[PDB]
Amino acid sequence: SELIVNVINGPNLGRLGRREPAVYGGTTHDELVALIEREAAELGLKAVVRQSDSEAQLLDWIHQAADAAEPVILNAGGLTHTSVALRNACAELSAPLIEVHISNVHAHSYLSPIATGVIVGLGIQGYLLALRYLAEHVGT
Amino acid sequence: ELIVNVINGPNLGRLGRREPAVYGGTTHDELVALIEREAAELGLKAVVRQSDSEAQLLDWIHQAADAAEPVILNAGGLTHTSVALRNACAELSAPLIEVHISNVHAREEFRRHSYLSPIATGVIVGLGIQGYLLALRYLAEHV
């Protein structure tokens, strides 16, 4: 069966493509969802791509990915340097966790120390590169 | 076509020989071939070089700066320890992608941080040797 991958975007990402397109790119979150779904499907993956500004909703999704042993690509957005609850929930995942940021945040994520790996600064392509890693490192 | 420089620092010459259970069984020589194959596939040329010498790495980075070529850099044992390397990289006009095989944020970061991360285009850590191939894909799509 095709590998289910959850792609979770946190606060601010709802404004992707609308807010500061000269910094984070012109692609909207809707277009990002479609691009990720297409590329995942090409790789034999099923991407479940969601955005929320609610910490509670993000935790809720992470908990389901934990129980289901499904990989997660997480861009915590505005919660990246603030939510300990996200860190704590992600610590319970039993499949890979790839943290992704569009911009190079380094120019102290709670998530990075507990993620499998991290991709930052590579734009929206970072999500696609994370998919390609998972396609090669998680089996069906 | 585009020429990409992959530069590997100290320790990376022992890839596949040192702690293969941690960094993988693929040797640096085999990594070169994997990178070369992927660059052929993507329509890029890749030059892959490794040295344990900081001075040698600085020379290669200065040369990439003068040539205006992109750099994929795994500073290896110099990651947390060479300001000079960062200064050299600051003069690169083409993209700079930092790659680490291991997730450096998980293993040994208490005080110390990568010097390169703030000035890199982007960073890939923890994705194993595939991280190099992923960085190549980024470069192919971006010039």
Ligand SMILES: O=C1[C@@H](O)[C@H](O)C[C@](O)(C(=O)O)[C@@H]1Cc1c(F)c(F)c(F)c(F)c1F
């Ligand atoms: O929401 C954020 C920032 O709070 C975070 O520090 C970086 C971040 O996670 C990233 O580079 O992916 C993301 C950056 C960011 C924004 F900061 C923002 F305001 C947006 F509208 C947006 F689409 C966007 F991607």
Ligand SMILES: O=C1[C@@H](O)[C@H](O)C[C@](O)(C(=O)O)[C@@H]1Cc1c(F)c(F)c(F)c(F)c1F
């Ligand atoms: O929370 C859920 C599921 O319980 C529901 O069946 C679908 C659902 O509401 C949706 O497609 O938006 C959502 C699916 C879902 C998950 F099931 C999940 F494990 C995630 F990690 C996740 F990000 C995600 F979006």
Ligand SMILES: O=C1[C@@H](O)[C@H](O)C[C@](O)(C(=O)O)[C@@H]1Cc1c(F)c(F)c(F)c(F)c1F
């Ligand atoms: O040389 C290093 C470490 O000194 C560095 O902290 C991380 C590092 O840059 C990375 O994960 O890519 C690299 C890790 C590492 C090693 F630490 C090492 F001893 C090797 F033989 C090796 F091949 C290797 F990749």
Ligand SMILES: O=C(O)c1ccc(O)c(O)c1Cc1c(F)c(F)c(F)c(F)c1F
């Ligand atoms: O918030 C805490 O201090 C804490 C204390 C005791 C615990 O058993 C515990 O799990 C936490 C919360 C916590 C994590 F869940 C976790 F995954 C961490 F990496 C962490 F540092 C942490 F501290």
Ligand SMILES: [Cl-]
């Ligand atoms: Cl890609």
Ligand SMILES: [Cl-]
């Ligand atoms: Cl790949």
Ligand code: NA
């Ligand atoms: Na495609």
